[PDB]
Amino acid sequence: MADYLISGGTSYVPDDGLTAQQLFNCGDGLTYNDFLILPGYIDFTADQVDLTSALTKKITLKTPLVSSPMDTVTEAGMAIAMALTGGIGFIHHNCTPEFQANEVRKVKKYEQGFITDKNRDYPLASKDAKKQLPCGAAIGTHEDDKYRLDLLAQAGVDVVVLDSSQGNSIFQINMIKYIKDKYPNLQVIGGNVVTAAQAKNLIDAGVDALRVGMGSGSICITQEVLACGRPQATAVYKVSEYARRFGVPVIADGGIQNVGHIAKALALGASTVMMGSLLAATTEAPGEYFFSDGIRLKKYRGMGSLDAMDKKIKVAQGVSGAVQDKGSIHKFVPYLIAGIQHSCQDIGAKSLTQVRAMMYSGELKFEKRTSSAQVEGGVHSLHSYEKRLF
Amino acid sequence: MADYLISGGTSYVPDDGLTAQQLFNCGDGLTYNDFLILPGYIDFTADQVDLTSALTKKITLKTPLVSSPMDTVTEAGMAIAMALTGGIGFIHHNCTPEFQANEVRKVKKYEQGFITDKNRDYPLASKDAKKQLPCGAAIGTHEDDKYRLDLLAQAGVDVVVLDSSQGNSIFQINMIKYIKDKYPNLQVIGGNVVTAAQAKNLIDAGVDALRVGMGSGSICITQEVLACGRPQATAVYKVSEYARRFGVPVIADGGIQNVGHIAKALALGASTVMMGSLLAATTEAPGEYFFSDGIRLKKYRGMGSLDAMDKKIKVAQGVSGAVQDKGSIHKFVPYLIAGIQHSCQDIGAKSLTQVRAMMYSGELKFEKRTSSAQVEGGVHSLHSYEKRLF
């Protein structure tokens, strides 16, 4: 019959909104708050949404959440918490290599299979072949980072991130090739990059994932000091679009402030999301809580801040501050998971993989927001209010 | 793994060419020769291509070919031949109603099941419930056409076409409602229309298919005489795009000169293709062969030509001429079928339904042709040549 024979199941579906390609073709320099995702069709419940994510070519996580390698964010405690909730943590390298290797060992010795030296309480916990938690580590691109890498490999790190503001450098590519030849099984994350040209240079060197973002971080002043960077949403879309031609996952790094930002980054092509300030002042973050006028808060600083580089003339690229206490990771990360699942349900996708497939196929639709639209989208017209997320 | 998890099976597939929507958004006023279909991916053979087509809401044919209701094209002989090759013929009404009903009866009595008054030699032959060939008939929108319709319904016609140059009229809509209430099972084809506004008016009246085309016919001079019409490719695309919102098939009528034109019309949203000149001077066309300077050819005239309307000032809308002999329908239609199948294979679709699904989804891609491109596409740079299609 005609109702089937005219177009074969694919029905009318009025065209309304912009595709991602149309949205990011305009060259406006958009970030997360400049656009929304239009809703789709719902025929399933939120709890059925699958958040399985690729961290690298060969490392898969049950959630897309990653803690940033920052000395005020990720040490062994935070890494264990993120592994237990289904993500991963990357241990910072603003320390001695022995200290870093000890932190990696503490992460890797939390759970064991056959000890050669709880699984039910944490179903989403990611594990390697030997029933051990996964762990990540940051290294630089200088000469001593080779010895640091040897210690980390001995400690049993599963993935290393090359920590730099501008990853498209001869130093970074040289260390990528060094690692590829000396530890052929080790997974390497390159970055940070914001353009497809940088991305091509790093993928040709053989990275297993790309870290995307420059200047969007909450503690960053790189854009205003060095005049270099890119709006985060455009950067994530462009680099993910390039990298998926070669099957390279993208980690979206910097500027994430809420669940909506996480969902937008995943919809734009990122496979995982890296969080700094959002996970600072949690119980598992390193450092100690302190009070400033009846407010509980913790230190949070950028790695390019003068205090961070203290332990010639130094050009600071980050600031040092404090953020309000958020509580425990074991209570905060489930809220993020539920929020992402609800966002996926609203846009009509059963999984993050299907979200990205719909985006690349043009089925997922977007819309811009003017300044008035953003104000309307926020809380308005109230004398006073209380905001309780969960 | 990441190779699956990044976008879920849907690979890169570099973007190249225009979608049909993009092509017909430019407002250039394109017809068939102004564009091409870009090739796709082939993983099947040409003979496996399915050409099942919807003529109306409830009438399905094995091929998309229809013979036009013209007194130099379709009588009982042509109708039987087209039914036997898998299409259908529409018997013209430039005759008395008794003559038309007799032609319909001759078509409907060619093959029988249980005669109440070969099926393997012609596998593609379309048949109704009682194993009889299908037949179509044209009627006008004047008062006496009701009596003509009664005679045709008694003769057992399966579908009637309302024959007019401009179908968006109060007369046509009145007769559509008359037919709907008096013969609730009879299928009605409305037209001719070239715009979505006309199409909406006719679909609201309850037609089961639309006949699309005004001024594109080979014998027609309506565009130059009445300044009204539309380029055929744009008309087919626009009207099919509107009509498929309601599950109404479109017959593309006029200006078809070759297999490439048939394939283009089907790719643009038409479900069947109506042919005039292409089927004139076949053996089954009415009239007798005659010679003019060693060339065998037959009369072919437009219904709005003065000779056609002869049997008060008449404004002619068509010319009368002759076309070269093509041979038999039973040998010519298989060539068209094979050509359409090869076109479908080249663009990478298993069926006409899938062709249209790909076009509406944006997977099928198109390209414009300049005048130099069209010349290049034709035969060139030769001293002399012979063109043998089959």
Add this chain to the structure above:
Amino acid sequence: MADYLISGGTSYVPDDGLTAQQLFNCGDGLTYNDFLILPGYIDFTADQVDLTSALTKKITLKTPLVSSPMDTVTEAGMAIAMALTGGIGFIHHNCTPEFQANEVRKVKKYEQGFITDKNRDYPLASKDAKKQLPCGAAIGTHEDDKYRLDLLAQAGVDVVVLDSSQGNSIFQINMIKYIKDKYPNLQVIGGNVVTAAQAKNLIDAGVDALRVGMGSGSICITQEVLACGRPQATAVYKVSEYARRFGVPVIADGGIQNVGHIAKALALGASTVMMGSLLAATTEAPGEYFFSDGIRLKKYRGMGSLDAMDKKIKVAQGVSGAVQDKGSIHKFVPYLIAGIQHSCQDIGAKSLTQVRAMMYSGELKFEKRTSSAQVEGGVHSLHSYEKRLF
């Protein structure tokens, strides 16, 4: 082989971002904060970046930094400091000609070769043929400015700037020709201009450099009072693009607030950058430090402010205020130098000359910033923070 023969060394390099010409063709009226420079490829260290800059046709400096001719900014002390750090200072003329000539003499007698009447402590110090520091001076376009010019030429000034808000005037052109005929060796800077038409008029008169900017200065209210001016980034790009057709350097004047602004101005085609407020409240700036509620700060006023013109009815074009203490030039200018070098390294250029060559060739790429993008580029999501640049 094909890897070389296909395109000869020039590899793919995916296209991403806008060229400067594309960015400033849109007519949006951009200034510095509306765009960023995308990062390039790094294969050298920051300290290897060469900042040699052309102040005029024949005067070359080792850094691109120039102090503005303002009575709260540049006197002999500031001029000596800027000469010693590799730049130059322009002595203001809101004084008597004898006072100005004495300041020029004090600058020119700081270092000597063969005295006819430290080289290692300051390697970047600019010097003339006779091992003396270079010095600049401002003059007006009125009649007595000829006598002022005679005194300055006797004092041995190396370059004079014609000080005006709108340099495209018959008065300015007359004085330019006067100076060219009377002091054929003296270098003349014309301005201020913001359009290529003004620039053509001044280059035809024979200037050796152009001063670009109108209304962008921190103390300026010309745009709001006289409705005339231009956004600074667009002005710098347009005028530099015109002036380089004739080999005329451009000084970018006004609205510089940080190292990122300096880098952007140099990337847009300027050869040197003139600074007002950024160098006010340094130790070498004229005037005395004073306290307002525990904050140390110095007077800073525009030359078109009523206080400035006090020493008929006067239309003020500038305001008078105070800015916070910055410390010494000998410590602040090295920070600017290091910042510019780091910006050049990030965008992948070995020198300012190569930065501009990449920009004109289209290799350097830019990106716009929405308001949300600018907010994201700034410090955000923090309860409190401290910003220590160096």
Add this chain to the structure above:
Amino acid sequence: MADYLISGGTSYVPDDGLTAQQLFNCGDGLTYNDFLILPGYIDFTADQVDLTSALTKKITLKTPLVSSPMDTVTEAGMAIAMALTGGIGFIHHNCTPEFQANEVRKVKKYEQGFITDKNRDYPLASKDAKKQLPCGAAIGTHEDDKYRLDLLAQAGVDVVVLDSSQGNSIFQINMIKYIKDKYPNLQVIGGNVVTAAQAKNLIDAGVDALRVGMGSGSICITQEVLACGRPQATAVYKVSEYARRFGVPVIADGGIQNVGHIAKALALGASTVMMGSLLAATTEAPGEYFFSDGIRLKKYRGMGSLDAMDKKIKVAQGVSGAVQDKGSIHKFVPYLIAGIQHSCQDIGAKSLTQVRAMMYSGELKFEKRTSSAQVEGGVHSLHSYEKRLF
């Protein structure tokens, strides 16, 4: 020779910026702060700029300044002051007709020629044939306004303005025709209008000038309450462009905050500028000065405010407030005159007539301003400052 024969005196003059027609074709909905005028060529001094302006077809003023018919702005004192400084005042009608006629008489009896029962202290003072100051008056479009008009005509008013928010009404057109037939010599100003369609309706009725502006006034809330209006700069340009086809002058009404705004309105096609808040809290404004926390200020209210309409259900269209004391008109208006003259000198025109001629010919050029550009154009980067206009 070729230097003349190639193009005949008209030289290259590089193309840079936008014409007014290009600027206002974009449909962005610009007001005064969204654009600047680019500078031109200066070959004359500021005092030589001629500000002669057409108020109506037959009434010419030496300055383009007009005081608004508002009960907190214009009574006899303000009307006399504006006439003496070269402009005109329009006496408000929120009073009895006898009171209004008495104010008109007080204005018309200030200076006399041959008294039927100083002119060198005020050279710019506008005068009629009998050496008397000109005076304007506002009337409504209701029935009793005819009697009010009779009293005003007897008092000797020279021009009447029809006071309404939306002037394109049958009531306004009826009163325009009434006035034209009963007082054939009286000059009538119609409005307020913001579109060319309204302008055509009023010009067809026979107005001698148009009052342009709806919702832009400082005390107005019409746009937010009735959703109707237009950005003032676009409104002035569009309506002036239409009205000059018929030789009808335009008064730009509302939203003027400074000299730059006046200059922009005149450059966009207006012949005179009407001022409300800018002239409120001057000594000559009606009402009494009063103090609020050490600040001297005066009442200023919109005519559509509830207090104004007090003396069944009233929809307020204006608010009531207070503005800071500005001093005397005799000192403030000369500042405006000098500012306008300086703006004309900067853009390179000898007169307002030549400003508009250059604008219509495309020689005058404009530029847009982003939000960052506007911030840059303002005062910035200062700890504190003092702004003394004159």
